[model samples]
Target: EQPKGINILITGTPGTGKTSMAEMIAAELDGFQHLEVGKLVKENHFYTETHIIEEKDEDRLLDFMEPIMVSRGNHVVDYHSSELFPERWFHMVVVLHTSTEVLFERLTKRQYSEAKRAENMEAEIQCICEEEARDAYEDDIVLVRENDTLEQMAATVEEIRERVEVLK
Candidate 1:
């Protein structure tokens, strides 16, 4: 019988490059699947309409994701809220951190509002994702510093692969 596949959770604030890292890691690693949680919410119509804006319903999203989390092969779940999922679901929870200046630039480039940009900056500056992951997961949480190049991200993925291999 085949051993159980590893599930990795890559999380960070909006502009911290979680999606890019997830895509790159999935592409580089064999048998690894990248699941963009935002995309999944959009595709499944699990969003709620309120006050002329639509927002993904957190509870509904988890309800939709529960089955997939349980019946997965190697998966990289990319989302900002790492604390939302149970600890047992993932083998590793990676929190990506970026400099406040870089994060601000990225958010500005995406045309985020001043208020939203500030909010995200505060979150990143406070290390909210890392704190949340630490609180949720024990030993498997890692904090990776995000920089200008994909090389660091690739190296982080490789590090995760080594950890997972040891577990297997």
Candidate 2:
């Protein structure tokens, strides 16, 4: 039990490279599994007629994931909308904040409506995910990492690996 695996939540505004981070982390780390929640929702049909995550489906996922997430260990959850996750489930929460201007540009390629784009941009500027993580886990386990360059990305990954080793 002393060396049990840890669950790390990589969450932030969209286009902040959480998926890339989660993918690399899970691929290189032994027994680490990458679960991109957006993909999970789509693949599981966790939507109602209006395409929002239905109330029933939310409970359905809770039933399935609540048991496994903490005990099963080594989960790098790439979550954009992560407030739904329980506060006690994660060991560490990393919020990648790429610059607002860059995200503003990055968001252009997506099919998001103008309002959707503005909301995401505002969220990024305010670092809502970081604030939410602090609200959940407090300051001790939440980290804000800059993710603009490949160099920074690699450095952050290596540091995360080091922390993972230390956590064990």
Candidate 3:
């Protein structure tokens, strides 16, 4: 019972602007819904540990996503890991990337511990999210720069609209 339309997965390391991009696209695209997977995971209690600051259960999310993936027509699934979902579920995977220095500055603003900030900076420098999406969906991955510039944001929006039209 798959939806008549396609799903878009927007993934990136923390502070890469995945949510902002996804929300913008969803707002402009008719019938498209944006789902913040991290928030959903916490709200639904779909994790192994039910602690206060919930930790996500990546494996459980696959099961939880099955029905929504089938029933919803257009979606923007925002998360850090694109590989967590089945390849069949996505029409396109958008990987947002920012420079290591920018990411360090952004995460620092979020007050992340020094160790955590370093770990995320390392992951971003290594292009983990982009590599993972490329590995999973070789032809369907789009890399976008998230440098908070008007030109970059506009270009990304245009590229995404084109991809959405093609997918639609």
Candidate 4:
């Protein structure tokens, strides 16, 4: 049987470069599809309804994911939220890790709105992103250190491909 295409996730604190890393992997993988949940929420207006928090989002997310899963080609997706996505759907979850100081510097450097920075910083400090990934996935989660440069991140992602479980 052919290996299933990997549904790899690059999740971490705000400054961990999750999106950038995911982009690199998507480009390298021959048939990997990128599925960014935030982009999907924006595109599908899934967040318009106020009640889709955890469980609701989980249920609705799979529904929204049908198109991507059935697509003829492969992709790599980057999204901040992980709870809504199930472990069953992913071949593996790559949880990025970053230093608190580094995360603080990155968030502050962005010079985003105070509210944005505050919220982001809080999440970063709490390690909410990684926590979510752990909570949503199984013990097979791959924790990647993203405190390095883009080249380093790319290298790490490449290493992870060796373990990706392709769809049967």
Candidate 5:
């Protein structure tokens, strides 16, 4: 191994911009990889024939990520269900959020089913991801970020890069 790279997590309810933010962070950093858990699921076919994730797939995904996280593999992972991951895997856990209105608009743009949209909207309101982040990690290591525009998201990416630079 050359050296250890900081591990970061950007997680939240589905429509909260975690994926975009993670990509930007990876772009800003030279050595870091953006691990889009959802995309990995799609690529690995971690879904049922009916196209929904199943318990077996969840286990497989966890198995796949175990070594990467255990090795501190220089990754910025975007997970909708971050609680399933080990807390110590991350140097920082950025629990991203957005307003309910913004989230609803994003879900609509993605053409999510009405029932699924409503379910995720309620998840956003509940801030369950934030709660789970804190529960899984130390309070100081658990960061809460909200993004409703490219302006803040860009700043957030830079801020993360800055923090990573200082963590020896």
Candidate 6:
């Protein structure tokens, strides 16, 4: 039987529409909560210092996530970090991807401040996500190219839903 609730992590490079896909999933499923970890961190002042090396922020996130993850309803989590969540609990992981050129275009379109733009562009050029996702999901990764049309994304999500059914 399917678990009473499901935890899903959507992560990708900065401009890859990670949040958009998460929203799509939430809309398609009833009784689902969309947990935005960055929002949570900011709202709770969990990472006031920004450089949270000493504190176990991931653990803190899991603690904050405990209630929603086990609520007997669907839940979608959109965050850049996925290593924090235990794999066993997550039903699926959506790993958004996009061509570096398109990614740069998206980021420029959003007009992030100069420093932010440079940082993101550097990260993209370095292929941070490839290194991250190399062993990142290692098992439950679902790759989505964010450059696809909305219709294409919807179809891809539908395909993923079907794939999850098999796992259940």
Off by over 4 Å in 5: 1-3, 45-56, 70-73
Q: Estimate each model's TM-score.
A: 0.84, 0.85, 0.86, 0.78, 0.87, 0.81
lDDT of 6 at 156: 64
Which is superior by TM-score, 4 or 5?
A: 5
- lDDT assessment of candidate 1: 0.78
Predictions: Cα RMSD each: 3.5, 2.6, 3.0, 3.5, 2.7, 2.9
lDDT tens digits, residue span 1-168, model 4: 222455566677666787777777777766666676667676665653632555655567678786666556655657776776656556667777666677667777876677776788788778788788877778665554665566678678767776654342
Question: Candidates ranked by TM-score, best first?
Answer: 5, 3, 2, 1, 6, 4
| Candidate 3 ranges with C-alpha deviation above 4 Å | 49-56, 144-148
Better by lDDT, candidate 5 or 2: 5
Give the candidate number with the greatest lDDT.
5
Off by over 4 Å in 4: 1-4, 49-58, 70-73, 108-111, 165-168
Off by over 4 Å in 6: 1-3, 50-54, 138-148
> Worst 10-residue stretch by lDDT in candidate 2?
1-10
As a TM-score, model 1 comes out at: 0.84
Q: What are the lDDT figures for the candidates, one per model?
A: 0.78, 0.79, 0.78, 0.67, 0.83, 0.69
User: For candidate 5, what is the TM-score?
Assistant: 0.87
For candidate 2, lDDT tens digit of each residue in 78-130? 88766677766777788898987778777887667789889899998887888
lDDT by residue for model 6 over 26-137, one digit each (tens)?
A: 8885556788877888776667374362357666867787767777877788876666666655777776776667777888989877777678778766766645655656
- TM-score-superior candidate, 1 or 5: 5
Q: Write out the backbone clash pairs for model 1.
A: none
lDDT of 4: 0.67
Clashes of each: 0, 0, 0, 15, 0, 0
**Tens digits of per-residue lDDT for model 5, 1-168:** 222567898989989999899888778776778888988888888778726777888888888877776564488899887777776677888988999899999999999999999999999899888888888888877778889899989888887877888874
**In candidate 5, which residue pairs clash?**
none
Tell me the TM-score of model 6: 0.81
